[PDB]
Amino acid sequence: IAKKIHPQTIIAGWREATKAARQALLNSAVDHGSDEVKFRQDLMNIAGTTL
Amino acid sequence: AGADEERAETARLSSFIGAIAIGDLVKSTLGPKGMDKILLSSGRDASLMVTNDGATILKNIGVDNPAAKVLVDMSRVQDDEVGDGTTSVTVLAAELLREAESLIAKKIHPQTIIAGWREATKAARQALLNSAVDHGSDEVKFRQDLMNIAGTTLSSKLLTHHKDHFTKLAVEAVLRLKGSGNLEAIHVIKKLGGSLADSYLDEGFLLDKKIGVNQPKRIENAKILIANTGMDTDKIKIFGSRVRVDSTAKVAEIEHAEKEKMKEKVERILKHGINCFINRQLIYNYPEQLFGAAGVMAIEHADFVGVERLALVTGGEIASTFDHPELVKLGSCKLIEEVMIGEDKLIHFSGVALGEACTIVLRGATQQILDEAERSLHDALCVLAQTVKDSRTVYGGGCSEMLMAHAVTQLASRTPGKEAVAMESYAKALRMLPTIIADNAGYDSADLVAQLRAAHSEGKTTAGLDMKEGTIGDMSVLGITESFQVKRQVLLSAAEAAEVILRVDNIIKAAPR
Amino acid sequence: AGADEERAETARLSSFIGAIAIGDLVKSTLGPKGMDKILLSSGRDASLMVTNDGATILKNIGVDNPAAKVLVDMSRVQDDEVGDGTTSVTVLAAELLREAESLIAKKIHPQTIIAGWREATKAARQALLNSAVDHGSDEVKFRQDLMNIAGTTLSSKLLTHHKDHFTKLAVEAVLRLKGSGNLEAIHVIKKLGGSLADSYLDEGFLLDKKIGVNQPKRIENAKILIANTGMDTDKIKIFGSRVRVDSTAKVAEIEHAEKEKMKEKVERILKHGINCFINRQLIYNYPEQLFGAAGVMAIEHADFVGVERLALVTGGEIASTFDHPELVKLGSCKLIEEVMIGEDKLIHFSGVALGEACTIVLRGATQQILDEAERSLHDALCVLAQTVKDSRTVYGGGCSEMLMAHAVTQLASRTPGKEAVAMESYAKALRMLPTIIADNAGYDSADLVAQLRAAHSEGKTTAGLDMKEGTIGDMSVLGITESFQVKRQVLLSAAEAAEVILRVDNIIKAAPR
């Protein structure tokens, strides 16, 4: 509201957001492995977070 | 004396309010990227409805006391003549009311202001008077048949994925209708089968009924019989009811009487060679067994509207009592058969000798997009029919409106001043349309106005409002064009009706008692 | 309901309201498209005053209970030290308060965020470090004499059509002033005549007054007399009484005594050779006639402010009782004359022995707005004195603010714990300045912010806000620069001012009712 000009212009962000959605992907390396089976990365990971 | 009388200042105000309220909602609908809208109501309304077409929603409701119901009703008459293209007529009509406030300042005769409408005719000569318009649409035309206005009509509409192809098809339909003739007997039905094309073009009339499981699959050298009176017999007037007779012995004469009806139908039907029978109403069971052996295909409960068109199509005939066969009836003979379209079974009538009437069948996937297919084709048939015979079109996306606005400003000075005062006010009205188109797609309204006027005043008619761009661009590349009739007709609808608002003295209807 | 009781968040709000109320009036005043505001009162005030300078209007009035007057008083010291340019310092302190709403979102200990004020100083060190300043100020100087800082102060004002030429002229005025003298004796008056230069520079001082229609047209080897007391004589405060004499014969003495005032004025004045008499107040009618025959030009109601500067100019004189002629009066002598400046008669005092005091009488194109030269000249005086002393400048048009803002965003993420939130809030404060500069330009504030931000990131200190452009451009080409002193002091002042009262929660009660 303080922006005080045009909320429609702001909509551009949602279109931006689709690209932004892919900023999550391919924008940084983090990890990725988790191949399958896994020796040390098998657990002591995600189950604990849900847990 | 109805009781509702308004004079001078107050009468004008009620009209003024009706136009502004409707203008804001319709504005987003216009152009290649329009917005789909949903409405909720209480009382004899169930839930939210979404209509891309502006005309359909206005038609459905008469919400309140202020005058606007008649103006809205009028748009349908417009819809039949050329109609839509894109909804915009309502927008232009709304804007002439804003200068009405400045009219009081002139302070003389509102009726002589009306001569301005005569000058509106003048607007028609000045609108097409300078700069440019298209110049081809020669006849048939190899590449200009479509990919222009029809695409624009549906561009606003959600269906423009598969649908833009459907629109292209519609000009083909006008090509067979081409020449000089009636805008009649063009029939379109959507289907539940799925295909990329989403539509098929038929060389004849499509119907969807069957005699029964028994009967030959197809007929050749087909002859067509249409009867006004039903096949059913027994009741007459004052039945003499089911009744009863001295035992079961005399019941037999009753069955025998029935047999006579059966024989008359076969004995003279055979001489003709009758291949198909179409009846609008209930059909008597006895003839059904007889038709199968003969090799004749009949249609139960055929709709009357299909029948009337069919008569024009096959040379017609005279429908009366069973005497109707042979010479009193005329039948075309290319071929009649029931063909599986892809999913459902339909019956095709084709190869009509007259050639005046033809039918289009649309298929589609089976969703909202197909229901709106109805919306789009009705819209399409009128625009394209006009495009072939008009020989003239204009650039869309506001190109025409800024250009016209420059043309109109020069002329007020040109004309004598009382006439000029009225005319100049009309001229500034065109400015609002550029503003309305830019605002709906996003970008702020006056920055667009600064850049927009400079490109149009330059002399490039092709340049228009590119909503995707946010600035100005070449309209022709987009492929947006408007039929010549839509532009002048909207001006007249904006005109004449706006002329009056003193003269009417009565405005609304709701429904039956 | 009412009592003036404050609780937690509400106490914070009182500080908050003062900041926001001041910011809206001040924000429109910043930059090229700033706005003038006019203020009136019924008594102890006579007319509406319009002050372009934000600092001057705040100082004069203490409108209400909430604290803000003390914060305002701070800009005075800044003004006498470095001065003006454009008033931006007050706005920056106010925006610091907006984050506070997000602070309750913290739902935690509010004063550890105070560390932000300890981040403000870190921000201050980088301002010194990153801005790009200048190299050169030879003294007098050929090309770099101006077209710099005076222009930025002028940029905020719409006079910058022909006026930027006038700003350029002002440095010539400062070159004579430059050094030991400090600020005194600079006087500016407009002329109603059109010319490209729009300004002229005078060696002496112009005063607009005349003795009367009669009197000698010109005086040379002029001697100047200034009197603290008027030529008027009759009351004396203590009347001496209504008075008793010895009938009508001696009262002739009273009327005669007036003549003695006349006699002293002529006899003593003649010996000196008196050419011009200047009196600060009303002048008695009898002496006026005497001056005309003698060959002496006197000035009725000459105001005091012109006189004090004039005294420094002529070496001055001791103004007292009619004994005042001769030696106690020192009259410099070159040329005193009334000269038609094509338009309106004015009197020129020139050939001053001192040389310290001079007058900048400008002609220029006419309208009400040439009174603007009064507005505009005053700005020129303050910026040049600082520009010569500092020998340092920074790029204007908000170029400094965006660069610093890009750097601070990185800083917040780098610092661990408590500190980044505090640092980032100070950092985003800088973001509003680009917005404030853009908004008054009439261009869209949102569009302006990102484009500006992208250019700064590249490393171009020169790049900045171009309001005339409506987008972004190279500030250096414009020639707009801000003095170095204004930027380093404001950073220390802004943080400290807002900081004290956030600290204190509760402005308390009273006794009364």
Side-chain angles (χ1 to χ4, degrees), chain B residues 181-203:
Chain B
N182 290 160
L183 180 61
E184 290 290 339
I186 300 170
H187 180 70
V188 54
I189 300 300
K190 44 117 248 176
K191 180 60 50 182
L192 290 80
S195 70
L196 180 278
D198 300 309
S199 70
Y200 275 63
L201 190 277
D202 290 340
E203 64 284 296

mmCIF file of all heavy atoms in Angstrom, chain B residues 181-203:
data_model
loop_
_atom_site.group_PDB
_atom_site.id
_atom_site.type_symbol
_atom_site.label_atom_id
_atom_site.label_comp_id
_atom_site.label_asym_id
_atom_site.label_seq_id
_atom_site.Cartn_x
_atom_site.Cartn_y
_atom_site.Cartn_z
ATOM 1 N N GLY B 181 -25.220 -13.757 -50.450
ATOM 2 C CA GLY B 181 -26.246 -14.658 -49.984
ATOM 3 C C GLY B 181 -26.575 -14.517 -48.517
ATOM 4 O O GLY B 181 -25.977 -13.721 -47.791
ATOM 5 N N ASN B 182 -27.497 -15.349 -48.085
ATOM 6 C CA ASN B 182 -27.995 -15.332 -46.719
ATOM 7 C C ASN B 182 -26.989 -15.879 -45.706
ATOM 8 O O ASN B 182 -26.270 -16.840 -45.983
ATOM 9 C CB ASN B 182 -29.226 -16.243 -46.649
ATOM 10 C CG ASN B 182 -30.441 -15.710 -47.380
ATOM 11 O OD1 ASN B 182 -31.349 -16.472 -47.715
ATOM 12 N ND2 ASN B 182 -30.468 -14.410 -47.639
ATOM 13 N N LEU B 183 -26.951 -15.276 -44.522
ATOM 14 C CA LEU B 183 -26.129 -15.818 -43.452
ATOM 15 C C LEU B 183 -27.066 -16.776 -42.738
ATOM 16 O O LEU B 183 -27.698 -16.447 -41.732
ATOM 17 C CB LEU B 183 -25.621 -14.722 -42.501
ATOM 18 C CG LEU B 183 -24.744 -15.217 -41.343
ATOM 19 C CD1 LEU B 183 -23.492 -15.900 -41.870
ATOM 20 C CD2 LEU B 183 -24.377 -14.068 -40.415
ATOM 21 N N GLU B 184 -27.161 -17.961 -43.311
ATOM 22 C CA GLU B 184 -28.097 -18.976 -42.856
ATOM 23 C C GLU B 184 -27.538 -20.378 -42.856
ATOM 24 O O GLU B 184 -26.530 -20.675 -43.495
ATOM 25 C CB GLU B 184 -29.291 -19.009 -43.817
ATOM 26 C CG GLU B 184 -30.207 -17.804 -43.763
ATOM 27 C CD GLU B 184 -31.011 -17.735 -42.488
ATOM 28 O OE1 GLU B 184 -31.168 -18.784 -41.827
ATOM 29 O OE2 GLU B 184 -31.496 -16.636 -42.158
ATOM 30 N N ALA B 185 -28.205 -21.208 -42.076
ATOM 31 C CA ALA B 185 -27.947 -22.632 -42.037
ATOM 32 C C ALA B 185 -26.495 -23.046 -41.863
ATOM 33 O O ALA B 185 -25.971 -23.820 -42.653
ATOM 34 C CB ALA B 185 -28.558 -23.297 -43.250
ATOM 35 N N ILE B 186 -25.856 -22.540 -40.839
ATOM 36 C CA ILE B 186 -24.509 -22.966 -40.535
ATOM 37 C C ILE B 186 -24.640 -23.548 -39.150
ATOM 38 O O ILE B 186 -25.027 -22.868 -38.200
ATOM 39 C CB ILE B 186 -23.473 -21.814 -40.560
ATOM 40 C CG1 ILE B 186 -23.434 -21.166 -41.949
ATOM 41 C CG2 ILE B 186 -22.090 -22.327 -40.175
ATOM 42 C CD1 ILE B 186 -22.632 -19.885 -42.006
ATOM 43 N N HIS B 187 -24.310 -24.809 -39.042
ATOM 44 C CA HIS B 187 -24.530 -25.532 -37.808
ATOM 45 C C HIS B 187 -23.255 -26.081 -37.213
ATOM 46 O O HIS B 187 -22.462 -26.694 -37.906
ATOM 47 C CB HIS B 187 -25.514 -26.666 -38.121
ATOM 48 C CG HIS B 187 -25.868 -27.533 -36.962
ATOM 49 N ND1 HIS B 187 -26.640 -27.095 -35.912
ATOM 50 C CD2 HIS B 187 -25.581 -28.830 -36.706
ATOM 51 C CE1 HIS B 187 -26.815 -28.083 -35.058
ATOM 52 N NE2 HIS B 187 -26.184 -29.148 -35.517
ATOM 53 N N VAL B 188 -23.051 -25.821 -35.934
ATOM 54 C CA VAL B 188 -21.878 -26.341 -35.256
ATOM 55 C C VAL B 188 -22.222 -27.046 -33.938
ATOM 56 O O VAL B 188 -22.948 -26.517 -33.093
ATOM 57 C CB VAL B 188 -20.896 -25.200 -34.962
ATOM 58 C CG1 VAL B 188 -21.595 -24.092 -34.189
ATOM 59 C CG2 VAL B 188 -19.701 -25.721 -34.193
ATOM 60 N N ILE B 189 -21.696 -28.248 -33.791
ATOM 61 C CA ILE B 189 -21.855 -29.052 -32.578
ATOM 62 C C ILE B 189 -20.506 -29.521 -32.035
ATOM 63 O O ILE B 189 -19.699 -30.040 -32.796
ATOM 64 C CB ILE B 189 -22.790 -30.264 -32.782
ATOM 65 C CG1 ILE B 189 -24.183 -29.794 -33.204
ATOM 66 C CG2 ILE B 189 -22.877 -31.102 -31.513
ATOM 67 C CD1 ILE B 189 -24.855 -28.885 -32.191
ATOM 68 N N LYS B 190 -20.249 -29.323 -30.747
ATOM 69 C CA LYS B 190 -18.997 -29.806 -30.147
ATOM 70 C C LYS B 190 -19.120 -31.316 -29.844
ATOM 71 O O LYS B 190 -20.228 -31.835 -29.689
ATOM 72 C CB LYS B 190 -18.662 -29.028 -28.869
ATOM 73 C CG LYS B 190 -19.861 -28.825 -27.959
ATOM 74 C CD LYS B 190 -19.667 -29.508 -26.619
ATOM 75 C CE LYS B 190 -20.636 -30.671 -26.472
ATOM 76 N NZ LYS B 190 -20.416 -31.429 -25.212
ATOM 77 N N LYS B 191 -17.992 -32.014 -29.736
ATOM 78 C CA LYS B 191 -18.012 -33.466 -29.516
ATOM 79 C C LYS B 191 -17.097 -33.878 -28.345
ATOM 80 O O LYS B 191 -16.229 -33.132 -27.925
ATOM 81 C CB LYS B 191 -17.659 -34.209 -30.816
ATOM 82 C CG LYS B 191 -17.654 -35.727 -30.690
ATOM 83 C CD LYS B 191 -19.026 -36.250 -30.265
ATOM 84 C CE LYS B 191 -20.150 -35.690 -31.125
ATOM 85 N NZ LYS B 191 -21.484 -36.165 -30.666
ATOM 86 N N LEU B 192 -17.334 -35.060 -27.794
ATOM 87 C CA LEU B 192 -16.576 -35.531 -26.634
ATOM 88 C C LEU B 192 -15.299 -36.327 -26.996
ATOM 89 O O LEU B 192 -14.584 -36.782 -26.104
ATOM 90 C CB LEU B 192 -17.491 -36.410 -25.764
ATOM 91 C CG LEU B 192 -18.615 -35.673 -25.021
ATOM 92 C CD1 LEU B 192 -19.790 -35.387 -25.946
ATOM 93 C CD2 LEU B 192 -19.075 -36.482 -23.818
ATOM 94 N N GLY B 193 -15.018 -36.506 -28.289
ATOM 95 C CA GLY B 193 -13.806 -37.237 -28.702
ATOM 96 C C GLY B 193 -12.549 -36.365 -28.647
ATOM 97 O O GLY B 193 -12.630 -35.171 -28.866
ATOM 98 N N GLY B 194 -11.373 -36.957 -28.444
ATOM 99 C CA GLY B 194 -10.160 -36.138 -28.347
ATOM 100 C C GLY B 194 -9.215 -36.233 -29.544
ATOM 101 O O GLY B 194 -8.848 -37.323 -29.982
ATOM 102 N N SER B 195 -8.815 -35.068 -30.061
ATOM 103 C CA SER B 195 -7.888 -34.982 -31.201
ATOM 104 C C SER B 195 -7.128 -33.646 -31.213
ATOM 105 O O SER B 195 -7.607 -32.666 -30.666
ATOM 106 C CB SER B 195 -8.663 -35.139 -32.510
ATOM 107 O OG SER B 195 -9.478 -34.005 -32.758
ATOM 108 N N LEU B 196 -5.929 -33.625 -31.806
ATOM 109 C CA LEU B 196 -5.125 -32.387 -31.907
ATOM 110 C C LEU B 196 -5.873 -31.289 -32.688
ATOM 111 O O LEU B 196 -5.835 -30.117 -32.328
ATOM 112 C CB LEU B 196 -3.757 -32.689 -32.542
ATOM 113 C CG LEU B 196 -2.782 -31.503 -32.725
ATOM 114 C CD1 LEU B 196 -3.089 -30.698 -33.979
ATOM 115 C CD2 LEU B 196 -2.787 -30.599 -31.494
ATOM 116 N N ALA B 197 -6.519 -31.689 -33.789
ATOM 117 C CA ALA B 197 -7.272 -30.748 -34.627
ATOM 118 C C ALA B 197 -8.396 -30.086 -33.835
ATOM 119 O O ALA B 197 -8.690 -28.905 -34.013
ATOM 120 C CB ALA B 197 -7.836 -31.468 -35.844
ATOM 121 N N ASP B 198 -9.049 -30.906 -33.010
ATOM 122 C CA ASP B 198 -10.144 -30.477 -32.129
ATOM 123 C C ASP B 198 -11.415 -30.122 -32.905
ATOM 124 O O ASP B 198 -12.413 -29.711 -32.321
ATOM 125 C CB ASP B 198 -9.708 -29.265 -31.325
ATOM 126 C CG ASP B 198 -8.504 -29.503 -30.445
ATOM 127 O OD1 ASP B 198 -8.505 -30.489 -29.686
ATOM 128 O OD2 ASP B 198 -7.547 -28.714 -30.541
ATOM 129 N N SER B 199 -11.364 -30.244 -34.220
ATOM 130 C CA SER B 199 -12.518 -29.951 -35.059
ATOM 131 C C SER B 199 -12.406 -30.605 -36.435
ATOM 132 O O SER B 199 -11.305 -30.860 -36.924
ATOM 133 C CB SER B 199 -12.683 -28.440 -35.208
ATOM 134 O OG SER B 199 -11.645 -27.886 -35.993
ATOM 135 N N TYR B 200 -13.544 -30.875 -37.049
ATOM 136 C CA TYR B 200 -13.593 -31.440 -38.400
ATOM 137 C C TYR B 200 -14.533 -30.654 -39.301
ATOM 138 O O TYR B 200 -15.549 -30.125 -38.864
ATOM 139 C CB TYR B 200 -13.951 -32.926 -38.386
ATOM 140 C CG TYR B 200 -12.757 -33.833 -38.176
ATOM 141 C CD1 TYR B 200 -12.009 -33.802 -37.008
ATOM 142 C CD2 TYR B 200 -12.361 -34.705 -39.183
ATOM 143 C CE1 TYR B 200 -10.907 -34.622 -36.843
ATOM 144 C CE2 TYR B 200 -11.264 -35.527 -39.026
ATOM 145 C CZ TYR B 200 -10.541 -35.484 -37.855
ATOM 146 O OH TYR B 200 -9.448 -36.304 -37.695
ATOM 147 N N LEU B 201 -14.192 -30.572 -40.567
ATOM 148 C CA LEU B 201 -15.020 -29.836 -41.502
ATOM 149 C C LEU B 201 -15.872 -30.789 -42.341
ATOM 150 O O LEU B 201 -15.354 -31.681 -43.016
ATOM 151 C CB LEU B 201 -14.141 -28.933 -42.381
ATOM 152 C CG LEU B 201 -14.887 -27.916 -43.256
ATOM 153 C CD1 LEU B 201 -15.384 -28.547 -44.549
ATOM 154 C CD2 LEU B 201 -16.046 -27.308 -42.477
ATOM 155 N N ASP B 202 -17.177 -30.589 -42.293
ATOM 156 C CA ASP B 202 -18.115 -31.409 -43.050
ATOM 157 C C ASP B 202 -18.597 -30.685 -44.302
ATOM 158 O O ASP B 202 -18.697 -29.461 -44.337
ATOM 159 C CB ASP B 202 -19.310 -31.833 -42.192
ATOM 160 C CG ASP B 202 -18.936 -32.842 -41.122
ATOM 161 O OD1 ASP B 202 -17.880 -33.496 -41.261
ATOM 162 O OD2 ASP B 202 -19.706 -32.991 -40.156
ATOM 163 N N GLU B 203 -18.885 -31.463 -45.328
ATOM 164 C CA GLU B 203 -19.350 -30.932 -46.608
ATOM 165 C C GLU B 203 -20.882 -30.826 -46.641
ATOM 166 O O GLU B 203 -21.465 -30.408 -47.642
ATOM 167 C CB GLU B 203 -18.855 -31.807 -47.772
ATOM 168 C CG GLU B 203 -19.408 -33.228 -47.770
ATOM 169 C CD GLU B 203 -18.747 -34.132 -46.744
ATOM 170 O OE1 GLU B 203 -17.531 -34.388 -46.872
ATOM 171 O OE2 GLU B 203 -19.444 -34.575 -45.806
#
